[PDB]
Amino acid sequence: FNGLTGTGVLTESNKKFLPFQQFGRDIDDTTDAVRDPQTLEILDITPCSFGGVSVITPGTNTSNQVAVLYQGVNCTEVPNVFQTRAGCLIGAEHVNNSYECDIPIGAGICASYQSIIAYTMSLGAENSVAYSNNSIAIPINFTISVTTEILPVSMTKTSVDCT
């Protein structure tokens, strides 16, 4: 603009600069607005859409097809499609059913193989226990179950000669 150099998408905004102020600044000290020196109109600057790309795969041992997630961005501007609070999904078909979360997408969405379906994860099977101020439930039989849990207690003792 004058010496202010940067990259971003521009837009006129409602901010009211004083007559002498040339450009705005953010709380974190990043440029946040600019005054056009020809027509003196106040512009607003937003960073160009960037985000990380993730690959959702059921495993090569299962199938060589995957679904891709573009974090954060909007499907309208990505150069089956499904917009989510976590990002844009492509290659995964959204279904209204719910299931146990196979692998997590984010914001309550999970994906799993079937052809890669994306669904709102189920917290569990619902049931209402027949509560009453008068009735109690007692078990007439029992089962013995053996559960196994694994804990690490140590790790390889490595020494690196610094010199």
Binding site: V53, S54, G59, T60, N61, V66, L69, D102
Partner: protein
Amino acid sequence: PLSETKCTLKSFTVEKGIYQTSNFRVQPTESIVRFPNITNLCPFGEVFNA
């Protein structure tokens, strides 16, 4: 994308999961230089035309 996942994992077999990959940017399509108006030109006239 599957091949890129293989490359980033450095394995020809990938187990079930979600993996990350290099990010992307909406590339800038042009440059925009916006210096203010030209004014108060130097008085070169007389030296060259007096």
